[PDB]
């Protein structure tokens, strides 16, 4: 089905300690493909996936140059929002931005996006019409006027509906063996008695790509989020991801308690029960 | 409204001379750019600056130094003038990181001629030619032509002026001044223009016709010992009247 | 040769469409521009286009195909005031140099509805020692070859326009000083039609 390309940008200011940090990172689905960190040696955009080093010198030079302008808008934005919010200079403050685009299973344009946060809360985002802004506060409005008179949205729409989707597919078919794979979960179940009265059943799901998975626990008939302990989906660090879900069972009822696994690599949604 | 301004329009330099072309920009842009333009290679980048304070070089940096103390002003200096710097120079401004539409704008240009010997500068002689008697007695229209001749550099501006006021309404001036004897690099120039009117406009003798040519040469604070008259920035005009035929 | 643009000159008459082309080589280019530069002045931006398809703005229409890397510009319904050279320019980002093409020169030839090709001789008002051969009113196909010597100086072909008869008419001029030269053999290095009026 769907694919996406998303770029995440983080700029954090360092009072008394000079220039802000800037990290940018490029994803296609849940695969990191490029990075730039203001701290690392090179001071270029560097590759992070094998299917992208086959881009030539002119890709690398350009990427590096735009990631610096990104760096520079951010560097200035730190002191602009310090200004807007009349904040003290002695405080470290965070700016994040992510833009990107979704495409469907024909690879044609679905959704495009561009949000901005200042200290971890929405500042202004591009609406889904790619025409109009959502300033979160009253300082933030000044940016909205600035961006409306600088025709920002129009340049962004052009990118999101064009260059963003044109490049996603270039990436998607360069890394055909990597990105268009779907990796089935290696399903698994453990049983550990806590005291003498209770026991914990744990549905494991390992070695899957992509990171979209849902595991729901369920007794007898209808389901349960009244006893679900779910961990956040975590990377194994080899491209695949991991998740568990658990329950506090009254003992003897483990026959009618059932686990439910949904994914993209699972044709029929699999169902296990402790045996 | 302004856009991108640049003084001067025209310049003659001798070899070794220093001159600084100035350029300015109303619109709050960050990215400015000097560019020379030439017949053999179109536009070439000299230097550019992507913010106030900072500057970097282009494809032809060499001979030209640049600075950017303010957002607004981006002056180009040529420290020692050289005959290979003879060009048209274009200021060019671009918004950069500050806002609004990728579009780059352009100054109106500075034509610069760098010559080895300053004795080569000549003003033009201007003549007005009266329409042929064969032309009037056939088409009932009347072409006045105007030769501007014997000038270096090609730094001129023709204008026709009837009865006191400037006509645009019947004129074709030549696009480019012609090399009179295309052997020399300091070869002088010639430029023609046409003004056509009706037969009854031409034959009315209250009608005064003048070809006007603003030449751009030496300043008045320049040393000049040679037996010729000093070729300063001046206007040479020719004229004719209406003939009662 | 990063932006290869159409060579020139491209000659079209009034009313015609004058399609221009430019191809570019950086794949990751993001804005595309057409400029207009009349001889002697500065390039003036006429069309910015930012994504695939056609962009319309009166008589101009730019097209963009990023897949085959081609920017076009068609000038629907030509005036003679469209005679210039048209520079295609392409950029990657806010800070990447704008890449100009070389230029295609466009000449809009005018409509002579009923020509009569004519050569005339002009004396001056006072005292400059050369006379003038105006060659005028002719067919828009006619060349004016300057290939004699450096004794006889000829101009190029130019177009005048009067707001009176709506009378667009072609001309060229030849002249020479210390000479034995006249008007009936001043353009016999060029193709003049067999109904040209020489004066007597």
């Amino acid at each position: 089905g769907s694919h996406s390309m998303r770029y995440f940008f983080t700029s954090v200011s360092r009072p008394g300690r000079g220039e802000p940090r800037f990290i940018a990172v490029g994803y296609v689905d849940d695969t990191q493909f490029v990075r730039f960190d203001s701290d690392a040696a090179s001071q270029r955009m560097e590759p992070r996936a094998p299917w992208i080093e086959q881009e030539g010198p002119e890709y690398w030079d350009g990427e590096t140059r735009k990631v610096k302008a990104h760096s520079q808008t951010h560097r200035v934005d730190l002191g602009t929002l310090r200004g807007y919010y009349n904040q003290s200079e002695a405080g470290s403050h965070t700016v994040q931005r992510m833009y990107g685009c979704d495409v469907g299973s024909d690879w044609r344009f679905l959704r495009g996006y561009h949000q901005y946060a200042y200290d971890g809360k929405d500042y202004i985002a591009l609406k889904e019409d790619l025409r109009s802004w959502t300033a979160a506060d009253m300082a933030a409005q000044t940016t909205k006027h600035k961006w409306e008179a600088a025709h920002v949205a129009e340049q962004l729409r052009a990118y999101l509906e064009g260059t963003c989707v044109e490049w996603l597919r270039r990436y998607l078919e360069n890394g055909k063996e990597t990105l268009q794979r779907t990796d089935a979960p290696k399903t698994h179940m453990t049983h550990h008695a806590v005291s003498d009265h209770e026991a914990t059943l744990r549905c494991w799901a390992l070695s899957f790509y992509p990171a979209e998975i849902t595991l729901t626990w369920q007794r007898d008939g209808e389901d349960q989020t009244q006893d679900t302990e779910l961990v956040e989906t975590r990377p194994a660090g080899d491209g695949t991801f991991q998740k568990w879900a658990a329950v506090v069972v009254p003992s003897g009822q483990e026959q009618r308690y059932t686990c439910h696994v949904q994914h993209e690599g699972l044709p029929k949604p699999l169902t296990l029960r402790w045996e | 409204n302004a856009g991108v301004t640049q003084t001067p329009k025209f310049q003659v330099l001798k070899t070794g001379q220093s001159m600084t072309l100035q350029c300015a920009q109303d619109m709050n842009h960050e990215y400015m750019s000097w560019y020379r333009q030439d017949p053999g290679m179109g536009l070439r980048l000299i230097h550019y600056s992507v913010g106030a304070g900072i500057t970097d070089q282009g494809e032809v940096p060499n001979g030209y130094n640049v600075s950017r103390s303010t957002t607004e002003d981006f002056p180009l200096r040529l420290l020692s003038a050289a005959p290979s710097q003879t060009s048209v120079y274009f200021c060019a401004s671009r918004p950069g990181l500050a806002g609004g539409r990728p579009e780059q704008y352009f100054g109106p240009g500075t034509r610069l001629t760098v010559t080895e010997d300053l004795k080569n500068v000549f003003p033009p002689e201007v003549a007005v030619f009266e329409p042929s008697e064969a032309e009037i007695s056939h088409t009932q229209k009347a072409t006045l032509v105007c030769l501007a001749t014997g000038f270096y550099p090609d730094h001129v501006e023709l204008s026709w002026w009837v009865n006191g006021k400037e006509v645009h309404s019947g004129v074709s001036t030549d696009p480019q001044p012609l090399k009179e004897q295309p052997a020399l690099n300091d070869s002088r120039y010639a430029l023609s223009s046409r003004l056509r009117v009706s037969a009854t406009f031409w034959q009315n003798p209250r009608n005064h016709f003048r070809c006007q040519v603003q030449f751009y040469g030496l300043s008045e604070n320049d040393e000049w010992t040679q037996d010729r008259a000093k070729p300063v920035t001046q206007i040479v005009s020719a004229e004719a009247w209406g003939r009662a035929d | 040769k990063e932006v290869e643009q159409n060579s020139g000159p491209l000659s079209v008459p009034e009313g015609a469409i004058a399609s221009l082309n430019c191809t570019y080589s950086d794949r990751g280019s993001q804005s595309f521009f057409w400029y207009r530069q009349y001889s002697g002045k500065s390039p003036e931006l006429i069309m910015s286009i930012y994504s695939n398809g056609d962009k319309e703005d009166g008589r101009f229409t730019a097209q963009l195909n990023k897949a085959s890397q081609y920017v076009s510009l068609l000038i629907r319904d030509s005036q003679p005031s469209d005679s210039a050279t048209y520079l295609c320019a392409v950029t990657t980002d806010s800070w990447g140099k704008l890449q100009f093409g070389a230029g295609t020169q466009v000449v809009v030839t005018p409509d002579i509805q009923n020509p009569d090709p004519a050569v005339y001789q002009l004396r001056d008002s006072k005292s400059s020692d050369k006379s003038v051969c105006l060659f005028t009113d002719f067919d828009s196909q006619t060349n004016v070859s300057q290939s004699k010597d450096s004794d006889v100086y000829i101009t190029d072909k130019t177009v005048l326009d009067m707001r009176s008869m709506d009378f667009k008419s072609n001309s060229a001029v030849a002249w020479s000083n210390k000479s034995d030269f006249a008007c009936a053999n001043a353009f016999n290095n060029s193709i003049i039609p067999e109904d040209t009026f020489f004066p007597s």
């Binding site: 770029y7 940018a24 490029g26 890709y59 350009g62 990427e63 735009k66 990631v67 302008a69 990104h70 808008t73 200035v76 934005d77 602009t80 929002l81 833009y99 901005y116 500042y123 202004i124 940016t143 600035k146 961006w147 600088a150 920002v152 340049q155 962004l156 990118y159 260059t163 963003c164 490049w167 | 990181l97 500050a98 806002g99 990728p102 | 990751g28 993001q30 804005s31 950029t91 990657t92 980002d93 806010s94 990447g96």
Partner: peptide, 9 residues
């Protein structure tokens, strides 16, 4: 491929 035209807030 990154956006080409970021603008200050």
């Amino acid at each position: 491929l990154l956006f080409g035209f970021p603008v200050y807030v």
